Design a protein around this ligand. Structure first.
Ligand code: HEC
Ligand code: HEC
Lengths: 130, 130
């Protein structure tokens, strides 16, 4: 598709991830009361998102070196193996997030912490900083 | 969280739907060669998107009457029954595209036609003509 379109989709993808992770983080932090049903609901939605195959999102020539409006580093394409590894770590942390969701604030907080680490670890090597 | 993030995720969700439907429509139009594997791949991602529960995308007070940058009509919330109806029509049509996607160009075109009808049916009633 056109580069602009791929970029819009890629950012949209992370917008959804952020939308569903947001209330889990809020609850882990104590900003928002713990609600096990709400927690499980967001958690399961996040699992669906990780099931989606994001290949089309990473069309060659759509890095920050190529088009504006994106924060995806060229590194993503030069290190396909490091990228799938950070993706896999995320997918696994999210899987663990499900059972934890309904077992208490302290457990959800622990699980959320692991997921959060995966967000950052990816950003660190593959997202431009500003 | 705030309207602006709900708005970006909703638009993001449709950007992904469009990204995956795009190659299916081009193949059906004869604008790109029929490739059964690729068709199957895009179809299956579309199925995964229809599984994502979109409830959080439709937070009250996020229609075009409320915030700028959205094309979602207040009608979505006024006619929740009819909206759900349009959504299911889309869900079902997408479910029928999967097996057809790799059965041939004519089969794929017919099925993509059905899906296409659902996109526009929902847009006619619930999306601002912008
Ligand atoms: C790598 C495999 C990543 C994982 C795991 C996470 N994110 Fe990330 N993200 C990644 C990239 C390459 C980008 C840039 C996208 C672009 O093209 O610019 C992002 C971006 C985001 C953003 C910004 C979205 C926007 O509107 O522009 C958010 C809010 C975001 N990411 C959040 C996020 C969270 C909450 C994660 C864990 C639950 C997470 N990401 C993981 C790469 C990767
Ligand atoms: C209702 C049940 C819909 C279905 C079925 C389809 N779409 Fe739609 N779409 C709908 C709404 C309410 C909106 C507005 C969202 C907003 O908040 O503005 C949209 C928007 C789009 C867009 C624009 C996305 C953007 O970046 O702003 C596209 C490209 C789009 N929709 C495509 C699309 C396709 C290809 C569909 C069928 C396969 C389809 N949509 C179905 C509502 C509904």
């Amino acid at each position: 598709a056109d580069a602009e379109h791929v970029v819009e989709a890629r950012k949209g993808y992370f917008s959804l991830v952020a939308l569903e992770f947001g209330p889990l983080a809020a609850m882990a932090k104590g900003e928002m009361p713990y609600d096990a049903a709400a927690a499980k609901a967001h958690a399961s939605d996040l699992v669906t998102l990780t099931k989606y195959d994001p290949s089309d999102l990473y069309a060659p020539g759509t890095s920050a070196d190529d088009v504006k409006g994106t924060a995806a580093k060229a590194a993503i394409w030069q290190d396909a193996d490091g990228f799938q590894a950070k993706g896999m770590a995320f997918f696994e942390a999210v899987a663990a997030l499900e059972p934890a969701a309904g077992a208490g604030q302290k457990e959800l907080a622990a699980a959320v912490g692991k997921v959060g680490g995966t967000c950052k670890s990816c950003h660190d090597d593959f997202r431009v900083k500003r």
